[PDB]
Design a protein around this ligand. Structure first.
Ligand SMILES: [Mg+2]
Ligand SMILES: [Mg+2]
Ligand SMILES: [Mg+2]
Ligand SMILES: [Mg+2]
Ligand SMILES: [Mg+2]
Ligand SMILES: [Mg+2]
Ligand SMILES: [Mg+2]
Ligand SMILES: [Mg+2]
Ligand SMILES: [Mg+2]
Ligand SMILES: [Mg+2]
Ligand SMILES: [Mg+2]
Ligand SMILES: [Mg+2]
Lengths: 167, 288, 211, 49, 157
RNA sequence: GCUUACGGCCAUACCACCCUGGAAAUGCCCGAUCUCAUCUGAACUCGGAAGUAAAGCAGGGUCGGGCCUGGUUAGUACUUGGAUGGGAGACCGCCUGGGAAUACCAGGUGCUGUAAGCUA
RNA sequence: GGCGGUACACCUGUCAAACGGUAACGCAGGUGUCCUAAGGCGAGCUCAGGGGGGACAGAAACCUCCCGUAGAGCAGAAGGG
RNA sequence: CUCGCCGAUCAAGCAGUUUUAUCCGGUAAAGCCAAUGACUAGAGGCACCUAUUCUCAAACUUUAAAUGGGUAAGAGGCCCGGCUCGCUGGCGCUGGAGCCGGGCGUGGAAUGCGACGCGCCUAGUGGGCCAUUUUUGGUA
């Protein structure tokens, strides 16, 4: 039971701007001033003219927070959602996610030059022992009685954050 | 959604090797490491195996055979309490002593322990034992790092340093020893001697007491109850290095003849396996 | 087209319409099941075949013509929902035809046997001795009509064919003398036109679903 | 004026006319193609025994 | 005509067995091949280095030269109507020890094991192999085994 | 018997689900000062020992899938050699030898080498 | 014969009849290049595809989880690996 | 010409042949409810998805013959001792190889045959055709 504490492993967030340029590098600064760490740019897989993107160009920027800073950014991100989410936002494999339209509602002042960017919070819920699938030597599977389910992760959102899950 | 694990999936499926499915053996690295040249004709190709658990360090020397490689000599890190090291049995300093134990124990059973003493006094600098003309050649083997990422400072190179200081002729370079600066490509010796004698552990024991003595009792709980303080770290490992070079031979434990009581249950026989179905069928027919 | 006397014997290796044999015209026969094909196993117990006695290849046009000849006689004698004809020969062997060989010419890359490998002409079904051509399952009292319907369709085929009333139950692979006994033991379950064999060697949950 | 391209018709009767003789594996087979390092030491082991 | 490519027609012989792909099991690498021992030749498509030609796949020869990763074999190859002794270089992944002479060496040691018994007992047990001799005279009992009458079954179409 | 290190053969070893187990050991786990490491001490590397079976791991379970073995298929299919055998032919029979495969059915489900350790 | 074509020097699969070899203006194709890396080595990583999700964002942009014997990729034809 | 028979199937050695042993293969067949590709029909579940089903491959195959290809069936063997090495190396025996000496015929499958032995010179031919079977193009 103590080794089954449904904790959060990582809180992944990304800013998917249109294309590269001065708008992207100013969007990456939004994440490093929100997460406290330099984010990583994401290139486009293919070339799509209807989206204005081509191959091997930085069109998005993302970051990953693990420790107690992850649940702090998640707390600020759920304030914008008023501590309530839908039901379909939870995946059948445990973890869930949501979205924020304006990053100014996360505890920072708006800069007139840096336009208001929208991010995408996806928290990867976990459990002590999930690192056996990540280590190289003796990499093992989690198992059925240890992996997180959808309704099991929803009750975690209703107890830790007193959240309201809309049907 | 179409199922990917159908009958045709398992029919066409080819399982990996057992040691590969378990994630223990890298056969790409093993082929280049244990296979002897064909113009050697059973010349044993030795290798030093260094493996780490969460609580123990294993140092082994083996040569590959068709029926399974034979372990020549083996030295464990839980044998160090016999020599003085009661705690920290998985640090870089214990790896040096576990490798030094393997080097002095192998040369003892091969009868050439008087020759090839290595470095009795530790300098941390580059050292390679050389064979003396007229005397039997030095034992040459190779490092089997396994799946450990060979980064500069990995404890597999501590056991490597302990073995080359014990008299083993293992080819290596000082690039992966703790104290090799990558931007200047220079190797400093005395900083490597700190990790060997546990001086980097003593600095951590001191800064914890000067900052948060509550965190010091949590990090080094068994260090303080065993009488191992930060000021006696360097000398504790030095006494073990002297004690290992004096009595490296391992004394096996007498096997205790027991009742041979197997705990877990055995497989159900074909009669029990069929009767269980016959009972479930009868129970399903009574309910209807 | 060319008469069927020229493509009667299985002289060449099977030459199917594939990545290499491109340009094959559509076979003459495209429908292989007729009648009340959506019938249960217990509705058409009888089964009669048109067994082939010779090792030849039947053209797709002959399979289409014999299908129509057999279909029309079953409708007027047993009704449009009193039979299920299954043409059990699919034309996969593609027959070739050489060029329209003429006197001479300053083009066409040839005039005689130069580059004689021909283009795909049609499709035939290589049948073996004892291989079923057409199968008809009907009621027990329509045996005389099925034998006659298959007898008329033999004239649309070259060689020699035999009309054999099978001992199997319908289009299944189980004899009539063993069929009704296996339904009682839940070893066979009706699956569309035929039955599905259920052994006693699966998960016991599937056994409970039957009982 | 076309002719016959390739044939192995009469060849088997011509092969066995004088017989298909296996290569005579003479005693003390030659040492051509052996490892030059191996031959170098072997010639040192012969000039000293 | 055909092409003279070195691997024309080797679609199935150099392929690996079904569900036997992947890395070569390392016991094949740690087999010692001395000089003069009988070895088979079975090329493998996994190791594209030191492959024997398709004419040697399935042939058997003796080793004359041993190297780091390979072995020199003296193989017989019939070209048209003459058999020639070919010295080919094949890596050890494409060869294996031939059990052809193992039955002979087993009989040699067994012949020397049974004739020294004659020098110590005084017998003349024959050591030569003999073809399958005609079956000796035997009695076939019908005590609990009565001859069952068989008859050809009628025809059924 | 069990736990590890290195393995050999490379599913009888895999896959799904369920149950049981911590003596030693293993694993999870506790931390980021040092070595090192990344967007992130998750991983990698390093330091450690508060908890002890949730997972890994091991051992069981499933008229389990797969796999393995055998039977059946079947002396069937095919095939060496033979005839001044049959038949318009297509093809077929016989003689002389060799001899399959699926469906189906049944059983089984890792074995083992070297080294170290422990009798829940 | 000429015209056409190149079966003229090569390569893959098949033909080819389970060693190898085996023809036709047989069949389906490829070649006269390309690459300072697309060569060499070491380390880390896992692909194709599908599914659950997640501001703008949709059948396709990016993040994330699960499944995934390779069904992707490996300059090119095809086969093998 | 070298021999063998002469001078005891002395024995070797050899074989378009078997026997024994050991490998090699992917054709016939078979299979596709196994992969790739082709293809028919219903049925179940919330166009697909699952379980079945009809019919196929020369450039498909899990499987897999018959016939066939290679190799081995001894003194050039087997066993033992000593010696040499600059190669190899914990270990002048650790490998390995070479050299030397000694011991042991019950020549250690069947059948046949003098060795189709070792050379030298060499004409003619280099348009073939036919049959059983196998087989490609073609209506033939
Ligand atoms: Mg001419
Ligand atoms: Mg010609
Ligand atoms: Mg000619
Ligand atoms: Mg070709
Ligand atoms: Mg070539
Ligand atoms: Mg190469
Ligand atoms: Mg448990
Ligand atoms: Mg089963
Ligand atoms: Mg030429
Ligand atoms: Mg052949
Ligand atoms: Mg001449
Ligand atoms: Mg001439």
């Amino acid at each position: 039971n103590p080794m089954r504490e449904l904790r959060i492993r990582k809180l992944c967030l990304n800013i998917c701007v249109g294309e590269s340029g001065d708008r992207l590098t100013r969007a990456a600064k939004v994440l490093e001033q929100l997460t406290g760490q330099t984010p990583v740019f994401s290139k486009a897989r293919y070339t799509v003219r209807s989206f204005g993107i081509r191959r091997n160009e930085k069109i998005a920027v993302h970051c990953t927070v693990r420790g107690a800073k992850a649940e702090e950014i998640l707390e600020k991100g759920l304030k914008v959602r008023e501590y309530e989410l839908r039901k379909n936002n939870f995946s059948d494999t445990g973890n869930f996610g949501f979205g924020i339209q304006e990053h100014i509602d996360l505890g920072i002042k708006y800069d007139p030059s840096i336009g208001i960017y929208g991010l995408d919070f996806y928290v990867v819920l976990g459990r002590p022992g999930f690192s056996i699938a990540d280590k190289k030597r003796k990499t093992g599977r989690i198992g059925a009685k240890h992996r997180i389910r959808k309704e099991e992760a929803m009750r975690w959102f209703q107890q830790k954050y007193d959240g309201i899950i809309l049907p | 959604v179409k199922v990917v694990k159908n009958k045709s999936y398992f029919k066409r499926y080819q399982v990996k090797f057992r040691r590969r499915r378990e994630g223990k053996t890298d056969y790409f690295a093993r082929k280049r490491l244990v296979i002897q040249d064909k113009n050697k004709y059973n010349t044993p190709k030795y290798r030093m195996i260094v493996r780490f658990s969460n609580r123990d360090i294993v140092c082994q020397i083996a040569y590959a055979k068709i029926e399974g490689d034979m372990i020549v000599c083996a030295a464990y890190s839980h044998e160090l309490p016999k020599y003085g090291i009661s705690v920290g049995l998985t640090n870089y300093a214990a790896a040096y002593c576990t490798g030094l134990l393997l080097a002095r124990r192998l040369l003892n059973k091969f009868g050439l322990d008087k020759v090839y003493d290595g470095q009795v006094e530790i300098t941390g600098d580059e050292f390679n034992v050389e064979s003396i003309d007229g005397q039997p050649g030095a034992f040459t083997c190779y490092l089997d790092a396994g799946l450990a990422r060979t980064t500069t400072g990995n404890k597999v190179f501590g056991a490597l340093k302990g073995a080359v200081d014990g008299g083993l002729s293992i080819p290596h370079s000082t690039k992966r020893f703790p104290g090799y600066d990558v931007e200047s490509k220079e190797f400093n010796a005395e900083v490597h001697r700190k990790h060997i004698l546990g001086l980097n552990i003593a600095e951590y024991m001191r800064l914890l007491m000067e900052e948060d003595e509550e965190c010091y009792k949590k990090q080094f709980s068994r260090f303080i109850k065993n009488g191992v303080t930060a000021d006696s770290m360097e000398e504790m490992y030095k006494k073990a290095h002297a004690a290992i070079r004096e009595n490296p031979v391992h004394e096996k434990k007498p096997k205790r003849e027991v009742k041979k009581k197997r705990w877990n249950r055995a497989k159900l026989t074909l009669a029990q396996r069929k009767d269980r179905v016959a009972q479930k069928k009868a129970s399903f027919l009574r309910a209807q | 087209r060319r008469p069927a006397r020229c493509y009667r014997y299985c002289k060449n290796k099977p030459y199917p319409k594939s990545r290499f044999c491109r340009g094959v015209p559509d076979p003459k026969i495209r429908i292989f099941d007729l009648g009340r094909k959506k019938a249960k196993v217990d509705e058409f117990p009888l089964c009669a075949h048109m067994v082939s006695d010779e090792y030849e290849q039947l053209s797709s046009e002959a399979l289409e013509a014999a299908r129509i000849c057999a279909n029309k006689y079953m409708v007027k004698t047993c009704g449009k929902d009193g039979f299920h004809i299954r043409v059990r020969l699919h034309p996969f062997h593609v027959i070739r035809i050489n060029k329209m060989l003429s006197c001479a010419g300053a083009d066409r890359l040839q005039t005689g046997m130069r580059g004689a490998f021909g283009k795909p002409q049609g499709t035939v079904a290589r049948v073996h001795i004892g291989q079923v051509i057409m199968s008809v399952r009907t009621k027990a009292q329509n045996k005389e009509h099925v034998i006659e319907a298959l007898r008329r369709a033999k004239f649309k085929f070259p060689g020699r064919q035999k009309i054999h009333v099978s001992k199997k139950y319908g289009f299944t692979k189980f004899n009539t003398c063993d069929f009704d006994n296996m339904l009682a033991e839940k070893r066979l379950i009706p699956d569309g036109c035929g039955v599905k064999y259920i052994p006693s060697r699966g998960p016991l949950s599937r056994w409970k679903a039957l009982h | 004026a076309k002719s016959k391209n390739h044939t192995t018709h009469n060849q088997s009767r011509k092969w066995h006319r004088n017989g298909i003789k296996k290569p005579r594996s003479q005693r003390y087979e030659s040492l051509k193609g052996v490892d030059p390092k191996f031959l170098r030491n072997m010639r040192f082991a012969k000039k000293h025994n | 005509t055909n092409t003279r490519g070195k691997r024309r027609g080797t679609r199935y012989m150099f392929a690996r067995p079904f569900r036997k792909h992947g890395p070569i099991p390392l016991s094949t690498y740690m087999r010692i091949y001395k000089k003069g021992d009988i070895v088979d030749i079975k090329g493998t498509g996994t190791i594209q280095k030191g492959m024997p030609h398709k004419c040697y796949h399935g042939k058997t020869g003796r080793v004359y030269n041993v190297t780091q990763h390979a072995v020199g074999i003296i193989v017989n190859k019939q070209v048209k109507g003459k058999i020639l002794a070919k010295r080919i270089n094949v890596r050890i992944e494409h060869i294996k020890h031939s059990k052809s002479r193992d039955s002979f060496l087993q009989r040699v040691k067994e012949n020397e094991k049974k004739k020294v018994e004659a020098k110590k007992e005084g017998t003349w047990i024959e050591l030569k192999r003999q073809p399958a001799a005609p079956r000796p005279a035997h009695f076939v009992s019908t005590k609990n085994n009565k001859p069952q009458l068989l008859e050809p079954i009628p025809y059924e179409f």
